């Protein structure tokens, strides 16, 4: 099929300034590179400006086409011509010939280079550094992410994006409803120095509220400095916070309003002017758009050599290659040998898909010298046509004593690249040392490397796209016994391994399994991905996933399909498609694991990455937290910094000037505080000594920083609603800890703040806060679960965020004191044995008996919540300095670095009004609340297990293997009756009481 295409050339006819054109009949089965070469030869033959084409090569030019008024680049030089989106578009328009413009590539402007430098500084990584790549996957992903980013930016309302509200659709729990009288709430609206209280319906929208307000204030505009020319030009914002109340959402569904109702606080709002939308306008994209068909090799019918003339073969289908895969190990070398002089070394080559090893071969052992030469072919028991998309050649270097081999080095090589082409030729891979990523060790000067050779072909070999063919086989009635066995298999928790018999059963009855979404992870775990026919059948099944698409969103199940056990692009794609219905609040709840799951993508560009990019570009809060999560992972994981960095570059390129400025100020503040912390650590010789000299030097350095270098204000990384201003230097101190963190207090920069209270930050350097972040996120998730049961357990999940490698910030919970400090302040060290001390402290803080009883009740609820949480999560090191109580009675735990199941001490029992073994009403309530919360979590065991499994791959010291996660399964008594579970937890309570 010769396709007629008209090419608009960069030169113009001598007499008319009209661009020259060349009509060509291009082989649809050719690639873009050959098409470009044919265009160049034709231009050399026909242009009146031949010297132009003699002086410049084709690579200096882009191939562009117009679609719906926009310009798209034909970017991938190896893309098969017939798969170009432009040809499909023109065929739909009955346009023949189509037009392609050959446009000269220009060098980047100095402004673009400066903006790139700014982006690199924000990222902490240079995404333009090609020094450490074996291919162009990074640049390819940069170009592919242009189109979805620009689609999201183009669909974005800048005014709504500037003021995106923090809301939830979840119904109000009964206990909050009881606080609303006659479905009405009181709101205090502030402007300048004046305020007015109004009574509104809990169902009123901010617009209705504004209309009623302006109607009531019509005769009092001048009093609130409202120009007569202005009308209900204004928005409602939270006092002291950058959080807006806009849209058609009922006032009761705003998170701030729910917080005020939960605490019993008045709802204070400011009547502000809306932010300038121009600050959220995005700079014009210099890059042409890239269509979603870029990198598509096409179908088998277009790539197959069967029935085709050799003249029409430019790419060969991978499914036509009926041979065993092989790799030549040339050898290894290392600049510095291991000190052990009598070691043999051998290479183990594995073909891996996800976590499964499909085949394995090894070289013969040879003496471990600075360089070891094998020069041998290892042929695998897998055919090329059966290689799955995402298959990795995992090379491992093992060492043994010269006559248990210890694994020393490893490296991975993706066999089918991002263009769906089988890799070929010579590779020098720099290997990681062992003290799923296809990235190599960046230390090319000192890291161990392996030289390998893959077969060379006359034509590139491409993985074809699967066509959804109707299955003619798509029923033996499943026997009731096998039905019960399948149901039992489906009912097991995610940690339960599938036997071979389970997998064969699941696959045999795959059509029955497809009727239950809960069977999907197990069914897909039974797929033999190293067999092309089974993979094709699996995709035919995925085409018939109507039950999945129509089902309710189970977030746990959907996230399980993104786990490291599932490397298939289509499975992950249907999971992300399901996640596109997830609300922004819940997305914030799961953002950490969503960021981590990107490590399991075979390529930089994926459905999950695009999902994250979209959600960040739609919601400033999500984008803020996404920025910080990605940046921390960039700073910490050399294995994945590139992937996170390219995703972060796309996001930042979509942010607008306001967000970029905020991020710049934040990073600057972090760098300055890091320098100060390093200086302060160098001044203190001993691990705990905070001498008066150290405090004075801290204050002096902070004063100098405030006067010279700190921004006047910045958004707080752990809470973008908070804006910190000037340091309250007199309140700043070094904390007496091994890591010497800085206690910092800033003034609120928002002039609408109702209290002169400071924003307190513990700045930590040399400490990895990702573990604390995970635990606090899980606590917020547990709170949501309990809220579904109308259980307010009054938890206080404070703000915590990692800002880099072992550097981050923690929120200071105000009016809260460690139990150790209370016990010390009342009677010295013996206070640990004084049951009355905590209750006396709480009564001192709450001298009003009604407030004291409310604090005791809040203590009961928060104690129950944290007891259940620390039990289920196995939180250790619970000394009295790692437990705090607020003056309002909230008990909460801090520092999550890690004889009784949980902390329930006699002084806690005394606050509950128990005396010895006598049960109090508050203690009975404690027991009932504990049981209810425990059972509520037991019902969500699968979600919890999945959330921790997805975090196994962060390198956290206390979450390294699945055995760590089995703790949750055992604590929740999976597989027991609900009565047995209730009794077991009550027994744990009594064990804690007795001990």
């Amino acid at each position: 099929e010769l396709i007629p295409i008209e090419f608009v050339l960069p030169t113009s006819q001598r007499n008319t300034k009209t661009p020259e054109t060349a009509l060509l009949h291009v082989a649809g089965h050719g690639n873009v590179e050959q098409m470009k070469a044919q265009v160049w030869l034709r231009a050399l033959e026909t242009s009146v400006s031949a010297d132009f084409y003699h002086r410049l090569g084709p690579d200096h030019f882009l191939l562009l086409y117009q679609k719906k008024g926009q310009w798209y680049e034909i970017y991938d030089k190896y893309q098969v011509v017939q798969t170009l989106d432009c040809l499909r578009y023109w065929k739909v328009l009955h346009r023949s010939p189509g037009q392609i413009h050959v446009v000269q590539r220009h060098a980047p402007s100095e402004e673009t280079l400066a903006f790139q430098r700014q982006l690199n500084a924000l990222i902490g990584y240079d995404v333009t550094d090609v020094s450490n790549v074996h291919d162009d996957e990074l640049e390819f992903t940069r170009r592919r992410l242009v189109t979805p980013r620009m689609a999201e930016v183009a669909g974005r309302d800048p005014k709504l994006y500037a003021m995106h509200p923090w809301v939830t659709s979840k119904p109000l729990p009964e206990y909050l409803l009881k606080k609303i009288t006659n479905n009405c709430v009181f709101i205090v609206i502030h402007r300048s120095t004046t305020s007015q209280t109004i009574k509104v319906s809990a169902d009123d929208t901010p617009g209705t509220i504004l209309q009623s307000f302006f109607t009531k204030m019509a005769k009092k505009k001048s009093l609130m400095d409202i120009p007569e020319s202005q009308n209900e030009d204004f928005v409602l914002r939270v006092c002291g916070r950058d959080e807006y109340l806009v849209g058609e959402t009922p006032i009761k569904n705003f998170q701030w309003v729910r917080q005020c109702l939960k605490n019993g606080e008045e709802i204070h709002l400011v009547l502000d002017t809306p932010p300038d939308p121009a600050l959220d306008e995005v700079r014009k994209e210099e890059w042409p758009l890239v269509d979603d068909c870029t990198g598509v090799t096409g179908y088998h019918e277009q790539l197959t050599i069967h029935g085709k003339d050799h003249e029409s073969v430019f790419t060969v289908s991978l499914w036509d290659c009926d041979r065993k895969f092989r790799v030549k190990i040339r050898g290894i070398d290392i600049p510095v040998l291991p000190r052990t002089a009598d070691l043999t070394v051998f290479v183990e080559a594995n073909i891996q898909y996800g976590q499964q090893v499909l085949c394995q071969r090894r070289t013969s052992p040879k003496p471990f010298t600075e360089e070891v030469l094998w020069n041998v072919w290892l042929e695998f028991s897998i055919k090329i046509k059966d290689l799955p998309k995402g298959a990795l050649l995992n090379l491992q270097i093992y060492c043994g004593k010269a006559p248990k081999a210890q694994l020393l080095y490893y490296v991975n090589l993706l066999l089918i690249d991002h263009r769906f082409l089988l890799r070929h030729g010579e590779y020098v891979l720099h290997m990681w040392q062992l003290s799923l990523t296809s990235r190599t060790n960046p230390d090319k000067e000192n890291s161990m490397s392996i030289s390998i050779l893959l077969d060379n072909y006359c034509h590139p070999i491409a993985l074809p796209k699967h066509r959804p063919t109707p299955d003619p086989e798509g029923r033996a009635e499943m026997p009731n016994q096998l039905r019960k066995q399948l149901e039992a298999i489906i009912a097991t928790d995610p940690l339960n391994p599938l036997t071979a018999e389970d997998k064969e059963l699941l696959w045999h009855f795959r059509y029955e399994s497809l009727k239950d979404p809960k069977a999907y992870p197990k069914l897909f775990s039974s797929v033999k991905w190293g067999q092309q026919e089974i993979v094709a059948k699996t995709y035919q099944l995925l085409a018939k996933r109507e039950v999945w698409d129509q089902s309710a969103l189970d977030v746990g199940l959907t996230m399980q399909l993104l786990d490291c056990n599932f490397s298939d692009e289509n499975v992950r794609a249907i999971a992300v498609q399901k996640l596109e219905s997830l609300e922004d609040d819940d997305v914030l709840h799961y953002l950490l694991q969503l960021v981590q799951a990107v490590k399991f993508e075979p390529y930089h560009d994926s459905a999950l990455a695009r999902f994250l990019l979209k959600r960040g570009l739609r919601n400033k809060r999500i984008g803020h937290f996404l920025f910080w999560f990605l940046r921390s992972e960039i700073a910490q994981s050399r294995h994945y910094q590139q992937r996170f960095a390219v995703i972060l570059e796309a996001y930042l390129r979509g942010c607008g000037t306001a967000m970029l400025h905020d991020f710049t100020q934040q990073v600057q503040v972090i760098d300055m505080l890091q320098k100060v912390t390093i200086d302060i650590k160098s001044l203190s010789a001993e691990k705990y000594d905070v001498s008066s000299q150290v405090i004075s030097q801290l204050k002096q350095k902070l004063e100098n920083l405030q006067n010279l270098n700190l921004p006047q204000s910045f958004r707080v990384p752990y809470d973008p609603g908070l804006k910190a201003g000037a340091l309250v230097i007199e309140k700043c101190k070094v904390m007496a800890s091994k890591k010497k963190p800085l206690w910092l207090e800033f003034k609120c920069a928002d002039p609408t703040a109702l209290s002169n209270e400071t924003i307190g930050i513990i700045f930590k350097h040399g400490d990895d806060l990702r573990q604390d972040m995970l635990i606090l996120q899980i606590l917020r998730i547990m709170e949501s679960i309990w809220e579904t049961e109308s259980l307010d357990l009054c938890l206080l999940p404070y703000g915590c965020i990692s800002t880099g490698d072992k550097i981050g910030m923690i929120e200071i919970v105000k009016d809260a004191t460690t139990i150790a400090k209370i016990q010390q302040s009342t009677v010295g060290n013996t206070g640990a044995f004084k049951d009355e001390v905590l209750s006396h402290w709480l009564k001192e803080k709450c001298p009003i008996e009604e407030k004291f009883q409310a604090a005791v009740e809040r203590f009961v609820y928060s104690c129950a919540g944290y007891c259940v949480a620390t039990f289920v999560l196995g939180i250790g090191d619970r000394h009295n300095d790692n437990i705090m109580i607020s003056e309002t009675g909230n008990l909460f735990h801090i520092d999550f670095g890690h004889r009784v199941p949980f902390v329930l001490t006699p002084d806690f029992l005394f606050v509950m009004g128990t005396s010895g073994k006598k049960t109090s009403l508050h203690f009975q309530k404690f027991q009932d609340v504990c049981v209810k919360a425990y059972l509520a979590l037991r019902h969500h065991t699968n979600l919890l297990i999945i959330l921790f499994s997805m975090m196994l791959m962060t390198g956290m010291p206390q979450l390294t293997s699945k055995e760590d996660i089995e703790y949750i399964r055992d604590a929740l008594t999976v597989g027991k009756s609900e009565e047995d579970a209730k009794k077991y937890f009550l027994d744990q309570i009594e064990v804690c009481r007795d001990k």
Partner: protein
């Protein structure tokens, strides 16, 4: 018909046994005997084809990779000369070739070349024979202007005069029988026969052609070439249209099975006495796809190869200056080892290890060649040379190395090149060894930069560019004979130890006023005396390192 089939099967099995058991005096004779047998009974060629195809298919099923390329090349050699091959056998061979495209290099590359030729021959039978004869015998044709020539170079100091005279006699005896008129007669006969099969009355055809004047013969030659080339150049060639055109020509010739020999290629024999001889001969060949193909075949040992490398380097350097040969001339290089009855056949050994078919066909020619020189007849050597230059099309590329030689540190260096080896010895002072300073970049598998500077006392050093064994990215293997001082109670004893390393470039300088002698490519005529310093590095492309290609049958079998 069954006895002839069994006889051919036994011959094919003999070739297969020679290939599977690399155990010397009859190596290569089995293939030659098979080719002679088919030449004596051309009407049985189809028989052999079937056998070969079966064996080929068998080899594919049993993963017998060592026999695929030899059998494939034998099949192609037979098909180039055979007439009356049924179309189904051509389709079977083409299908086999297409299936082999799944094999790694070199199998896929050879199979692709064969598939191209087989497709053209299936649609237009006789194309292979006609094109081969026209190109190799320099027959004038406007529609097929390609010309090929074999240039046979021999060093008279390396190969005896008796060998040269015997080879010259065989070549001249073959060329005296290959007159342009005889070749035109062969092309016409072969084309008409290949197209018409049993409908071609071969006897009447031969009588008519022998009785025709030169003008008539030339007319029919041009008509046949025109028909074949016109049908072959069509987008969709049809065997039926080709048959119709050939029937028209045949009827015009005669009005409304003698074996047709495939002539040996035109071979010019040259005693290599001048370093410029090759250049001059190529320029003369070009004097009135590249239209001309020069197949330069050298007979000799490693010294002859060093000379060929020098000539090749000079040719590339000149081409960068006057661009006169490369737009029109495809240069292919071939090597036949003639070793005196083990250090001078290094490259030969290497080739034999990487291409077993080369080992069994070409490397075994040295005794026969020598035997031919002692004799005061089927041209065995000429047949093997013909087969080699026609079927050996897979190049193996060898890195050339440049050496700068300093006799004094104040004078400009003399530059030369080598291919196989650079040997260095310490000159005797008109006391054992000389202190040498060496600076080199160690060749590691990671390509990590590692510069090494060492000073040691040595008696000699050898840089080898060709790997010695299978356990050995083009790098030099350097062996230094170091003098180690051992102080025993009984006095100062000196022992010699050999240290080996690999490097891409190396600089060596004598420190104790003792001078060095260098030998290039083991050639006593390429000796440099009174040398103080030398530097070796990969030879750059005359403006990428310069690589020299030597054609074999299979290239590098991995």
């Amino acid at each position: 018909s069954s006895d002839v089939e069994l006889d051919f099967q036994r011959s094919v099995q003999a070739v297969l046994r020679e290939l599977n058991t690399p155990n010397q005096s009859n190596q290569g004779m089995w293939r030659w005997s098979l080719h002679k047998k088919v030449e004596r009974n051309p009407g049985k060629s189809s028989i052999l084809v079937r056998i070969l195809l079966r064996e080929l298919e068998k080899a594919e099923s049993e993963d017998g990779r060592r026999v695929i390329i030899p059998l494939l090349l034998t099949l192609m050699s037979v098909l180039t000369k055979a007439t009356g091959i049924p179309e189904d056998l051509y389709h079977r061979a083409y299908t086999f070739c297409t299936r082999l495209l799944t094999l790694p290099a070199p199998y896929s590359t050879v199979a692709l070349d064969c598939a191209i030729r087989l497709k053209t021959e299936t649609a237009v039978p006789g194309t292979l024979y006609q094109r081969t004869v026209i190109a190799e015998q320099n027959l004038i044709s406007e529609l097929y202007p390609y010309q090929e020539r074999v240039f046979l170079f021999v060093d008279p100091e390396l190969v005896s005069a008796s060998v040269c005279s015997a080879l010259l006699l065989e070549i001249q005896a073959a060329q005296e029988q290959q007159t342009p008129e005889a070749c035109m007669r062969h092309v016409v006969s072969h084309a008409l026969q290949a197209a018409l099969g049993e409908a071609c009355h071969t006897g009447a055809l031969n009588r008519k052609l022998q009785a025709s004047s030169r003008r008539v013969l030339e007319y029919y030659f041009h008509a046949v070439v025109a028909a074949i080339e016109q049908v072959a150049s069509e987008d969709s060639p049809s065997r039926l249209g080709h048959l119709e055109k050939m029937e028209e020509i045949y009827c015009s010739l005669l009005g409304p099975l003698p074996s047709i020999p495939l002539p040996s290629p035109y071979i010019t024999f040259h005693l290599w006495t001048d370093q410029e001889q090759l250049w001059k001969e190529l320029v003369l060949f070009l004097r009135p796809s590249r239209v001309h193909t020069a197949r330069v075949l050298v007979l000799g040992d490693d010294r002859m190869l060093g000379r060929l490398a020098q000539a090749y380097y000079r040719l590339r350097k000149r081409e960068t200056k006057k661009f006169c040969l490369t737009p029109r001339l495809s240069l292919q290089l071939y090597y036949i080892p003639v070793l005196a009855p083990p250090e001078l056949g290094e490259l030969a050994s290497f080739l034999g290890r990487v291409d077993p078919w080369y080992e069994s066909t070409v490397n075994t020619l040295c005794p026969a060649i020598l035997k031919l020189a002692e004799m005061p007849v089927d041209p065995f050597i000429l047949d093997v040379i013909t087969y080699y230059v026609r079927m050996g099309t897979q190049p193996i590329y060898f890195q050339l190395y440049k050496v700068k030689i300093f006799t004094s540190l104040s004078h400009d260096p003399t530059e030369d090149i080598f291919l196989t080896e650079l040997k260095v010895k310490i000159q005797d002072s008109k006391g054992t060894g000389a202190e040498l300073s060496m600076c080199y970049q160690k060749a590691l598998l990671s390509h990590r930069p590692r510069e090494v500077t060492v000073s040691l006392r040595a008696t000699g050093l050898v840089l080898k560019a060709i790997p010695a064994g299978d356990t050995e990215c083009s790098c030099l293997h350097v062996s230094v004979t170091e003098v180690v001082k051992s102080s025993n109670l009984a006095g100062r004893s000196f022992t010699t130890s050999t240290n080996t390393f690999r490097t891409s470039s190396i600089q060596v300088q004598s420190q104790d006023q003792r001078l060095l002698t260098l030998w290039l490519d083991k050639d006593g005529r390429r000796t440099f005396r009174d040398v103080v310093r030398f530097e070796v590095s990969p030879c750059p492309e005359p403006c990428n390192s310069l690589l020299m290609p030597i054609n074999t049958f299979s290239g590098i079998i991995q």
